[PDB]
């Protein structure tokens, strides 16, 4: 059933699985109309589909054209997510198809289950983890490809860069979740921490800077400090 | 008016006939039920005084043969049987009547309750849901499982209700996933009505039969079937107007008849709230909504 702290190691076993986060699929700006009413303008979105073992990110860009002349968009967004994930699974060879898909939001279970009836052996699961994948659009290179898209497009990333050469997927996922948590809690502070030292760059084929093992420990420290500070602010404690 | 004679009543038992019920004492000189209205299916049902576990009973139609009850002290139950000798049967029934050892089916002239609960129910359809083709009557009890319950284990003793599953390839057309899941009209009208049931009468007959097995035997799988068949109509944006008007009447008599004390185990809160307040048909069941709100406001 549901995925939690108790069965955390399962993410890093040799059964292919994907996380699906739909929190950036339907995105709007709210503004005043000339008559002083309120209207939304949709902007480009993305499905965040991640293999937590390999770091392979299937970023399906959702172009605003998919909403044209549709009603009940927040409901359609769940079904469109489920359609795109099912299209992605069908496009993979059999031996690459996931044995499980974990949705970060319970509203995705029925839409994905209905779209995957052809795949009765693929388990659709919720999670009790509060994963910060919503912050994916705080990664500059992912944000840039989403906002520049002029049509529907799938872009393939490794969200771990070359980390798996040096650390396990357990540790790579912990680093990713801490970076995203930070970016989600205080984006300005988080991005300042990541780029304050101009000598450390982001390779053209990477998302994050090229930190030595020692520099990651320091970065990881500064991100934990940012999170606890902001927590003592939010809650005055 | 037809008669179901009893050889005897060797064990103390509560006997139901349709919506009526009578206590018979161990070895009480009880020889059966007379004045049974011709033209309807009937159910004769039993709960032993010594084991209120296993309610059980027999669906029959008196037009299809001469039926009697006889206790089997080996299998420990009242069994329905057919008498093929028409003269032996008439002679037996006449003696017991003359000696007034039979209770009279106690129909009030004004009272259409049993007709209203059984309008679409036909013995030939019951015999396809309950398979035992060597008898013209059908045995049901509390513990019998449905074909659908068995998928999720003796097939001979199962209730063969039509399988309804909202998250099934049958229910959902490829490329119409969101449409078919949020509006089940395709599933109701093309798959079930045109495809499997052939008309709304057979659909209502199975719905009514499932309710009565739920109420008279507390058959859990029958209760699930009755709720699924309601929910498939309520969740469809497109239903013939005559089906909605008839569903409102059907459900009205079912809610009116349910023992007040069993609402907690026989009524599914989620399905009813959804059907009366959220569904496409939320404004189409006036009689049902009014009796539910006045009789079971707690459930909602």
């Amino acid at each position: 059933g549901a995925m939690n702290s108790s069965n955390y190691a399962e993410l890093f076993n040799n059964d292919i699985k994907l996380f699906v986060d739909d929190t950036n699929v339907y995105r709007v700006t709210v503004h005043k109309t000339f008559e002083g009413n309120v209207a939304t303008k949709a902007i480009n979105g993305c499905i965040f589909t991640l293999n937590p073992k390999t770091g392979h990110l299937f970023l399906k860009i959702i172009h605003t054209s998919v909403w044209a002349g549709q009603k009940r968009l927040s409901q359609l967004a769940k079904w469109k997510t489920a359609e795109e994930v099912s299209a992605l699974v069908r496009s993979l060879p059999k031996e690459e198809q996931p044995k499980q898909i974990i949705v970060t939001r319970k509203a995705m279970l029925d839409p994905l289950e209905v779209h995957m009836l052809d795949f009765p052996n693929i388990a659709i699961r919720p999670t009790e983890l509060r994963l910060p994948f919503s912050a994916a659009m705080s990664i500059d290179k992912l944000s840039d490809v989403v906002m520049k898209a002029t049509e529907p497009q799938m872009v393939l990333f490794n969200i771990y860069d070359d980390w798996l050469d040096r650390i396990s997927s357990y540790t790579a996922f912990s680093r990713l979740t801490l970076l995203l948590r930070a970016l989600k809690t205080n984006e300005e502070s988080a991005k300042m921490i990541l780029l304050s030292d101009p000598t450390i760059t982001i390779k053209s084929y990477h998302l994050w800077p090229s930190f030595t093992d020692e520099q990651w420990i320091t970065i990881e420290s500064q991100m934990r400090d940012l999170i606890l500070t902001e927590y003592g602010r939010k809650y005055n404690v | 008016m037809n008669t179901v004679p009893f050889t005897s009543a060797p064990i103390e038992v509560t006997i139901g006939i349709d919506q009526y019920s009578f206590n018979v004492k161990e070895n009480q000189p009880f020889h059966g039920i007379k004045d049974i209205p011709i033209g309807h299916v009937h159910v004769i049902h039993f709960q032993h005084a010594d084991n209120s576990s296993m309610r059980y009973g027999y669906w029959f139609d008196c037009r299809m043969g001469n039926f009697y009850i006889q206790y089997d002290p080996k299998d420990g139950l009242y069994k329905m049987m057919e008498e093929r000798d028409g003269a032996k049967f008439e002679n037996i029934v006449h003696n017991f009547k003359e000696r007034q050892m039979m209770v009279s089916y106690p129909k009030i002239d004004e009272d259409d309750t049993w007709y209203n609960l059984t309008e679409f129910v036909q013995m030939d359809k019951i015999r396809k849901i309950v398979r035992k083709d060597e008898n013209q009557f059908s045995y049901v009890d509390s513990s019998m499982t449905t074909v659908q319950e068995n998928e999720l284990s003796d097939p001979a003793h199962s209730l063969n209700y039509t399988v309804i599953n909202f998250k099934s390839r049958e229910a959902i057309r490829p490329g119409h996933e969101m449409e078919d899941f949020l509006d089940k009209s395709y599933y109701l009208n093309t798959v079930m009505l045109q495809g499997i049931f052939k008309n709304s009468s057979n659909y209502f007959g199975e719905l009514q039969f499932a309710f009565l097995n739920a109420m008279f035997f507390g058959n859990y799988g029958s209760s699930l079937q009755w709720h699924a068949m309601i929910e498939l109509i309520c969740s469809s944006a497109t239903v013939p107007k005559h089906m909605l008007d008839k569903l409102d009447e059907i459900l009205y008599y079912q809610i009116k008849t349910l023992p007040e004390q069993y609402s907690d185990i026989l009524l599914n809160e989620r399905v009813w709230n959804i059907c009366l307040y959220s569904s496409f048909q939320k404004n189409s069941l006036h009689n049902t909504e009014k009796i539910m709100e006045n009789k079971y406001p707690e459930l909602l």
Side-chain angles (χ1 to χ4, degrees), chain A residues 1-235, chain B residues 1-151 154-300:
Chain A
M3 201 273 289
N4 51 39
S5 317
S6 310
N7 55 17
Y8 191 69
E10 191 183 15
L11 295 181
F12 312 114
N13 74 9
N14 288 95
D15 285 2
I16 300 171
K17 42 182 73 63
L18 298 173
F19 277 111
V20 169
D21 185 79
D22 70 315
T23 68
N24 285 309
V25 168
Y26 176 45
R27 305 201 287 159
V28 295
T29 54
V30 178
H31 62 87
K32 281 294 196 61
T33 73
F34 181 83
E35 293 81 17
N37 305 135
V38 170
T40 56
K41 197 202 145 292
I43 61 165
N44 283 351
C46 59
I47 309 164
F48 182 93
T49 297
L50 171 64
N51 183 324
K53 177 80 178 191
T54 67
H56 287 202
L57 174 63
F58 300 90
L59 194 80
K60 177 59 192 222
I61 303 183
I62 308 301
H63 187 256
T64 56
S65 56
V66 306
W67 313 126
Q70 306 297 322
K71 282 99 177 68
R72 293 198 52 84
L73 295 183
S74 69
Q75 173 190 262
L76 178 65
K78 295 171 209 316
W79 291 86
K80 178 52 173 199
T81 300
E83 182 180 4
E84 288 303 347
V85 168
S86 55
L88 166 65
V89 170
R90 297 160 208 276
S91 78
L92 290 165
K94 195 184 192 221
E95 73 273 1
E96 292 175 45
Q97 291 180 340
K99 291 305 175 62
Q100 298 174 23
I101 309 172
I102 312 155
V103 299
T104 59
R105 306 201 294 178
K106 299 193 205 72
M108 276 303 308
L109 289 163
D110 281 346
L112 194 55
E113 164 165 9
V114 168
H115 272 280
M116 300 294 289
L117 293 168
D118 290 337
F119 293 100
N121 292 335
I122 303 178
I124 307 301
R125 301 176 57 208
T127 184
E128 298 298 348
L129 297 174
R130 42 275 200 190
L131 295 161
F133 298 146
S134 73
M137 285 303 86
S138 297
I139 303 166
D140 285 321
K141 285 191 189 193
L142 302 188
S143 184
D144 285 350
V145 69
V146 167
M147 291 312 283
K148 294 189 210 290
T150 60
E151 49 186 315
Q153 183 188 356
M154 164 75 86
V155 184
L156 288 216
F157 293 94
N158 191 319
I159 203 156
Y160 297 156
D161 297 344
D162 64 343
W163 306 338
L164 292 184
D165 295 346
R166 299 196 67 84
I167 66 178
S168 63
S169 61
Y170 180 104
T171 304
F173 192 80
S174 311
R175 181 179 291 159
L176 175 69
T177 55
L178 171 65
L179 291 172
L180 289 173
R181 185 56 66 200
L183 281 160
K184 190 173 170 159
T185 317
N186 191 324
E187 178 175 39
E188 185 209 315
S189 289
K191 289 187 179 197
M192 282 175 65
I193 291 166
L194 286 161
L195 322 161
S196 62
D197 178 338
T199 76
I200 321 157
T201 63
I202 306 170
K203 288 310 145 285
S204 55
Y205 54 86
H206 283 170
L207 295 177
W208 316 98
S210 296
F211 292 121
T212 65
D213 292 19
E214 306 311 313
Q215 293 172 329
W216 267 126
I217 301 294
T218 303
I219 294 293
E220 287 175 344
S221 323
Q222 292 178 0
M223 290 299 194
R224 294 189 190 98
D225 288 352
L226 173 161
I227 290 159
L228 298 177
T229 307
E230 279 311 332
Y231 175 97
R233 205 221 163 288
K234 313 316 172 72
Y235 292 108
Chain B
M1 308 307 269
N2 278 115
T3 303
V4 170
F6 277 48
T7 300
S8 66
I11 76 167
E12 195 159 299
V13 59
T14 305
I15 306 183
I17 171 76
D18 301 350
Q19 74 265 40
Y20 310 106
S21 75
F22 305 106
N23 295 315
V24 172
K25 298 299 175 288
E26 177 187 303
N27 290 306
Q28 183 186 321
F30 174 78
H31 296 293
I33 307 173
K34 62 177 193 157
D35 305 323
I36 305 170
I38 312 173
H40 306 125
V41 67
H42 295 286
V43 58
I44 183 161
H45 44 109
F46 299 97
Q47 187 154 220
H48 299 179
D50 73 337
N51 184 233
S52 65
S53 288
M54 188 183 51
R55 278 177 275 162
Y56 64 95
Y58 305 90
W59 292 95
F60 67 95
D61 182 334
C62 281
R63 294 174 286 182
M64 291 166 71
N66 301 307
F67 308 114
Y68 67 106
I69 300 289
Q70 181 167 106
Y71 182 70
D72 176 4
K74 184 163 162 77
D75 292 336
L77 78 179
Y78 288 99
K79 296 204 163 152
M80 182 162 283
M81 297 205 270
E82 180 165 358
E83 181 52 74
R84 70 153 301 110
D85 190 348
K88 189 166 183 200
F89 191 77
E90 288 165 9
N91 174 227
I92 282 311
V93 168
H94 177 274
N95 171 85
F96 285 159
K97 281 197 183 175
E98 275 291 294
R99 304 227 290 143
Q100 296 190 43
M101 303 277 99
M102 307 198 173
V103 291
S104 181
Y105 188 96
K107 200 192 159 300
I108 301 331
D109 313 322
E110 171 187 23
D111 171 54
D112 264 353
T113 294
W114 188 244
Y115 172 80
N116 292 333
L117 289 170
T118 61
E119 181 164 356
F120 302 98
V121 182
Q122 305 284 354
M123 262 312 314
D124 75 295
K125 296 318 205 302
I126 291 177
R127 293 179 78 238
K128 292 173 199 310
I129 295 158
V130 193
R131 311 202 155 290
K132 195 177 225 269
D133 288 330
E134 65 270 32
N135 303 146
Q136 297 281 292
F137 50 82
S138 300
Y139 174 89
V140 184
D141 66 31
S142 314
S143 68
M144 280 168 59
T145 52
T146 74
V147 157
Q148 168 169 82
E149 281 183 308
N150 292 332
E151 296 169 355
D154 183 54
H157 211 72
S158 278
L159 295 164
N160 190 46
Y161 293 122
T162 299
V163 179
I164 302 183
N165 178 3
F166 295 140
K167 298 192 287 190
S168 73
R169 173 51 64 222
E170 291 68 26
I172 307 290
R173 280 170 303 175
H176 303 259
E177 286 82 4
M178 183 184 190
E179 176 199 6
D180 285 349
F181 186 73
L182 288 178
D183 171 6
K184 313 204 186 275
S185 292
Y186 150 73
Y187 193 33
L188 173 64
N189 290 309
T190 298
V191 178
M192 289 278 163
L193 284 178
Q194 166 176 275
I196 301 180
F197 284 102
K198 304 313 180 181
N199 52 63
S200 55
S201 295
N202 295 333
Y203 186 103
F204 288 144
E206 185 167 325
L207 185 157
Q208 285 181 317
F209 183 55
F211 172 73
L212 293 173
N213 286 323
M215 180 169 61
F216 287 129
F217 307 115
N219 188 265
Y220 177 71
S222 293
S223 183
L224 295 179
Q225 184 66 15
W226 173 59
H227 285 96
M229 297 192 73
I230 298 174
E231 188 167 9
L232 175 54
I233 293 170
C234 295
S235 293
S236 297
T238 304
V239 186
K241 308 85 171 65
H242 77 270
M243 267 192 80
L244 289 174
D245 288 336
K246 188 60 64 160
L247 179 64
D248 195 24
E249 292 302 317
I250 288 164
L251 296 178
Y252 175 80
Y253 286 103
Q254 290 171 339
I255 299 308
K256 182 171 173 59
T257 301
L258 267 182
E260 304 69 44
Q261 303 280 309
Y262 292 45
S263 44
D264 56 331
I265 59 180
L266 285 168
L267 292 181
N268 185 290
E269 180 189 66
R270 176 195 71 91
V271 168
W272 282 98
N273 278 279
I274 271 50
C275 291
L276 297 179
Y277 303 124
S278 317
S279 82
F280 291 104
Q281 306 302 341
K282 64 199 183 302
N283 290 333
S284 305
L285 307 175
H286 304 108
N287 297 352
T288 293
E289 180 167 308
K290 196 169 298 308
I291 189 167
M292 278 289 294
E293 285 187 351
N294 282 280
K295 190 175 186 209
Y296 302 117
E298 325 92 50
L299 202 93
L300 323 163

